[PDB]
Amino acid sequence: MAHSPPGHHSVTGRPSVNGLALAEYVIYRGEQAYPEYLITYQIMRPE
Amino acid sequence: GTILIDLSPDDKEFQSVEEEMQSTVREHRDGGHAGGIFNRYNILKIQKVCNKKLWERYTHRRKEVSEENHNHANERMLFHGSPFVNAIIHKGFDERHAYIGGMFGAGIYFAENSSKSNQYVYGIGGGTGCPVHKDRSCYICHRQLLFCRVTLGKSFLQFSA
Ligand SMILES: [Zn+2]
């Protein structure tokens, strides 16, 4: 694994171009996330 | 250490999690190649993941970050998709759930869009699709995403035009 940019704890991928996209985020230490919910699902075929 | 506790569909906590899956689906620029063609999900089950030792590992790091950042953890609830969900819920996130080829270098990726995390359920770019039918748009096979508490602290802002 690579390190965080100096003085930072994470990277925020701010979406440009695609006006509808939300952000992505990257952390570099696994202890900075906890898996609270496991969601089991299917994608639905559109009508 | 890990225990999975089912949430009833009647629980307001089931509801608010499902509302966050459903309401963060968007259309993707691949037309569906990676994650399939859909506008919404059929939610089959939601389980609360309970591991004391992993939780303490999380809160310990959270306190460090918070004290490095004027008592602001910058904690979010984000989605994560991966074929190693079952290892993550038993052993935690570490460098073997890094995405080394990613847009922002090698680390662990999370998304506000549920549908973005869905592109990664069967691997990078969706891999070869579901194990049973080899179909990145499978409408039958059960998929799994994590909804995760993430400490961002001070976040490096990268623009992606
Ligand atoms: Zn399938």
Swiss-Prot record, chain B:
PTM annotation: Ubiquitinated at 'Lys-48' and 'Lys-63' by RNF146 when auto-poly-ADP-ribosylated; this leads to degradation. Deubiquitinated by USP25; leading to stabilization. ADP-ribosylated (-auto). Poly-ADP-ribosylated protein is recognized by RNF146, followed by ubiquitination.
Source organism, top-level taxon: Eukaryota
Disulfide bonds: none
Domain PARP catalytic: 8-161
Tissues expressed in: Highly expressed in placenta, skeletal muscle, liver, brain, kidney, heart, thymus, spinal cord, lung, peripheral blood leukocytes, pancreas, lymph nodes, spleen, prostate, testis, ovary, small intestine, colon, mammary gland, breast and breast carcinoma, and in common-type meningioma. Highly expressed in fetal liver, heart and brain.
Function per UniProt: Poly-ADP-ribosyltransferase involved in various processes such as Wnt signaling pathway, telomere length and vesicle trafficking. Acts as an activator of the Wnt signaling pathway by mediating poly-ADP-ribosylation of AXIN1 and AXIN2, 2 key components of the beta-catenin destruction complex: poly-ADP-ribosylated target proteins are recognized by RNF146, which mediates their ubiquitination and subsequent degradation. Also mediates poly-ADP-ribosylation of BLZF1 and CASC3, followed by recruitment of RNF146 and subsequent ubiquitination.
Similarity-based family: Belongs to the ARTD/PARP family.
Protein name: Poly [ADP-ribose] polymerase tankyrase-2
Organism annotation: Homo sapiens (Human)
Recorded name of the encoding gene: TNKS2
Shown chain mapped onto the complete sequence: 952 to 1112 of 1166
